[PDB]
RNA sequence: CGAGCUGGAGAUACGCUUUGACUCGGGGAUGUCCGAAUGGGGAAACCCACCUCGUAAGAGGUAUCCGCAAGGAUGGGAACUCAGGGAACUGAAACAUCUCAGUACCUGAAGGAGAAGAAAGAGAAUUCGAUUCCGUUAGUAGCGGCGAGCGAACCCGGAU
RNA sequence: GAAACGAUGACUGAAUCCGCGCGGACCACCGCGCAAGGCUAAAUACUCCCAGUGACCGAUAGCGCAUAGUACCGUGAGGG
RNA sequence: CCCCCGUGACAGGGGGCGGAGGACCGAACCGGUGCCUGCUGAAACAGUCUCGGAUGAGUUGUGUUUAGGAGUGAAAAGCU
RNA sequence: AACGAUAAAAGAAGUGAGAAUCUUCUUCGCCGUAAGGACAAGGGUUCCUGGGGAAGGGUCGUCCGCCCAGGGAAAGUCGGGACCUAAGGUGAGGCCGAACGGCGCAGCCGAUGGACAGCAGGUCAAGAUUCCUGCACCGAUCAUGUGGAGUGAUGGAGGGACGCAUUACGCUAUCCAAUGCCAAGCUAUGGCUAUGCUGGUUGGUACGCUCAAGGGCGAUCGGGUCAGAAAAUCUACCGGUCACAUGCCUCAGACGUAUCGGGAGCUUCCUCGGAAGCGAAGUUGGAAACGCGACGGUGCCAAGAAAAGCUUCUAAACGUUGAAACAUGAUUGCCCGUACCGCAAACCGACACAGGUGUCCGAGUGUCAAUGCACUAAGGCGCGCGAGAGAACCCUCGUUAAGGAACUUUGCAAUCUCACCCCGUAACUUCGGAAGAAGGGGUCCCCACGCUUCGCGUGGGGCGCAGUGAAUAGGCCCAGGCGACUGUUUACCAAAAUCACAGCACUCUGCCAACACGAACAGUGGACGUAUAGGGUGUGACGCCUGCCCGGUGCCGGAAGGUCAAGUGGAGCGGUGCAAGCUGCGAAAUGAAGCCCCGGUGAACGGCUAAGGUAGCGAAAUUCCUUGUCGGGUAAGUUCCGACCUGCACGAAAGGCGUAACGAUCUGGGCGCUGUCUCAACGAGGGACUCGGUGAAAUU
């Protein structure tokens, strides 16, 4: 049990829902996590302990950097208590060490990857997932994000060793309305049992549908939504 | 609404005709035999309060 | 002004008045608190401060936007004026262009009025001579699912 | 529309007085004007307020009120 | 969790002990199943009886947010 | 017609013009986890006193929550402000926008949370942690004395700081018992003569070597600067040195002593009922919190506000000759709230309205327990018409010969069953369940003995028709349809087979994500998330499974070609001028996404021409003919179960078939019981009828 910030709850913008679904569940502070992980580069830190974090998925390591900065950061799959952990350059690929992927191996699991130098931590966040290094281009390296898609990350962002902790949400099986309860509030209403009103689905005597389509107009089995966009060129192979 | 209701105004006529039956009896008033203020018939004299010797108060 | 007055109040008491009450004109001086509201806060009319002078009482100051400053501005107006924005019912015996109509409404700015105004003009006389307003031209010329229907201007006569 | 002229959001972007704009595509000729700077009384519109008048009303009329935006209705705008 | 018995592809089974649950019965409390009553009501939706939930996807106060082709909706075109 | 719950009333005495209705006495009855008491909201003087008696009061009033007049409301410590922050609101500057305006960091506003000093009594007709009395406490300013030096932000750190369940030990509030104590008297009907009866039986504070559960705590010297903007003696980290039990520190509460208080009652006066004075006893034993000790223990996953006050640090600063802090005086003590009603005749419901309204306290006896049920304390109340009668009929009830579902759409309704203990208990199953299955027996009183108590066990005896002797109080079972389950819904005719659900799938989205709100290159939600995540669609636990058709439509993918817009391009055609020229119109070619065209795609829309049904089911919530046909059950079976197949018109995630358990679901059967019925009777209460009082309505 320690220090952190309010995670005040909400599922509406600055006006009316927004986002569908998402209510109920259990009170929940925010765990400040490091992600840029740079201030701290030539420290080392040993895990003081692992803790069940909340607005993650994943564990999370309490760090001790000799200087006297407590910080939490991503627990990943195999980092336990007393293991030692260092960031920059000047930094071996061993489990937990943030280092740029110019000194990263090829094949080499990842996770916490960045997208762009400084900002932080935006790819493999999720427990299991991991990038696996590709192999290195000009001043970018490819790689395999967890989607499958292949993605052009500038070799100066940084990264951290290993995949991510909590093993699987597997055994996790829910099991009664409720437990989505603790969480989210009732999700799918079918719009089939709605209204011509309410959603395109929505009328008719009985069972049935006839067009496929979402909320509001568009249509959801296959229809690409992404846009023609700049971050196109950095990409390589979408498709899963 | 208020199920079954008047057809039609009853005359000035018809309703006075089932009032014959209404007008009040007048006492059977006896003259009081030892004060004289009237009573009536098995009941005790109100003025003097006798009944052949005096039962009440005033 | 010249004997009354003491508000409607018609009610008793106290009184005031020709050393001119009362009422009528016309200027002053007071003018709590809220309100543009303006020290800060606020569920108007209440709560809480700081500065300066001051014998405590008490008096003055503390909003933002223009500009050295002087000095100006915020808010309020029944309708009328111009501007930004701008419907539908309706009519076309249905309806979509069209009509209703740049009407209704909202919003901004302002005044006792405003707007507009001193020809890169009107129009065919090598006439006129800023603008507005009224008469008339004239239901003309023209517009128009050339349908419903819409509808000028010059000339000339006047207000100025 | 044969649709000129004004105006202008986007893109362009001239001449300087043997110059420039217009005269209902457009060209010639004839004719009327000086843009891209500003100010401006008066006649005109209205009626919160005041006065005067009326083949206007006179208490179910006339303003909603012989005075009340009250009583009363409504959470409120509002209605009365 | 601590002890007892078993082995032939089997698991477990016994005792203690602990104190789980959109678990059970049931009041407060939330609710509205069936009948009657009530239908110019005691009431513009109720009453007596009966009945559902009753540690949960629970109930409830204050404060605050979203509204008009708009909101909200465990979805009736419900509620506003 | 009605006069607003069937919780009653009776009499006496008083008052008055007038009395069922106002007052007083004595009974009666009703509530008593309330129908008693204390708030909050809300109301606004309704509060108390004296007076009134037109209207209001469902009747009458002499009375009132009505009408008139007067009065009453007292705070340094209670709640709010002069303190703090949440959601939200606002917001100089800053980001957007036809206007009006929309956002938005810090800051500011905002309690429903944090923080913080007073307890016991007394008493107006009407106020009390507010006034009075007794004794405290808090901050500030100053005077005195001790101290003899530091104080220590707007900044740092620590602290405030927070869940759900369950539970060990001590306690108190509080409650019971008694031949404990104290007080008052008396009783008699047959007795008792007190070992009977009734009542009371300790709060505040101070001091105390007294008993005390439970709770809380490491201390110090160092090292790196790379951490807290900087500094720190503070805090974080790493290290060295004594950290078992203990050891410190705090004492819920009890006990003793003292003191102020209260205390059953007793007493004197009385203008009829108050005022004043006095004042006993303080036991032993039991029970006991949701309160206190406390931030205790354990377990769990869904992982449990912030900010100030507070404590510790240094920056700046004034300073060491007059510090901070302690101690004893004195002085000081702002604003608003405070009456009264407050589960209701004072609030919301037009009404003195059978409805609604957040929190707290809520006693005793009996009953496993309890805030259940019955009676009952304190306390409050009898519900603002009354009186007769004892018809029809209507409502709410009690009993019912013989029969027992024959009632009927349907056992609708109403019975039966009913608590606790012992015995006992089926198919089926997901191994939990089904289960309170089903069915049987016990239950009171006394005495003896045994024991863990309020008690319970064995034994013997007693009484009644009957012993959870009254109240609260499951009827059960067989089979089927649908839906797995708890849950949700049509406020006011539908609770369900609807919606949701755990689980499955298709699919989209690489992050300024897809998507969504929006004037908007604003801002925001998705998300302080990041593909084991988020959007959307569908199916709907679990088990076995989920087939054939890609022609049309949609979606993804191809491009060799056909088509294809602005623009580029100006060949050519024409107007006018004497002309240079200025002008109207203007092909070919080239020019993008889209469409024609090719292939794929089904848990894409769909079909059973692109193919004609793989399992499984089938007269079905689907079957027209139809009461299909045979079987079951019945005396008799349009329904129901079972087969069969001729499926008008089943069929595989618009899921097919099954499934234990669950259900105010729907269907058919059985046992039980019964006024549903043959077939109705008697009885009760409230109306209906009668008199007095008040007196509507739709309709015409
Ligand atoms: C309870 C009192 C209220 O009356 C009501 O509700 C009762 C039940 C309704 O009766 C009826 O529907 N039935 C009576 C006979 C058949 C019918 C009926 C038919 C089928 C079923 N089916 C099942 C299987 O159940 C049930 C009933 C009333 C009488 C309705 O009148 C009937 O209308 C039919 C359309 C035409 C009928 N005639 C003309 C042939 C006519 O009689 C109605 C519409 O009111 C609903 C009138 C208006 C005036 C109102 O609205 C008043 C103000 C009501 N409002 C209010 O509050 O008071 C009320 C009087
Ligand atoms: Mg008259
Ligand atoms: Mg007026
Ligand atoms: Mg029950
Ligand atoms: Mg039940
Ligand atoms: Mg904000
Ligand atoms: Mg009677
Ligand atoms: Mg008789
Ligand atoms: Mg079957
Ligand atoms: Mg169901
Ligand atoms: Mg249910
Ligand atoms: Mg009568």
Known sequence: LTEALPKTGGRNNRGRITSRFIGGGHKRLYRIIDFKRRDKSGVNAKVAAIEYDPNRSARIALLHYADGEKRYILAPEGLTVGATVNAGPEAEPKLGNALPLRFVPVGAVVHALELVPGKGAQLARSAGTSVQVQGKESDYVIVRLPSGELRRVHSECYATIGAVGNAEHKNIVLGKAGRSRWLGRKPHQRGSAMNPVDHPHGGGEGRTGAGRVPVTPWGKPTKGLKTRRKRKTSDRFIVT | ?58
């Open chain 2, 1 to 58: 609404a208020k199920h079954p209701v008047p057809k039609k105004k009853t005359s000035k006529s018809k309703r006075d005709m089932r009032r014959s039956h209404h007008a009040l009896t007048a006492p059977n008033l006896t003259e009081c035999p030892q004060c004289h203020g009237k009573k009536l018939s098995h009941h005790i004299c109100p003025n003097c309060g006798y009944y052949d010797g005096r039962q009440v108060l005033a």
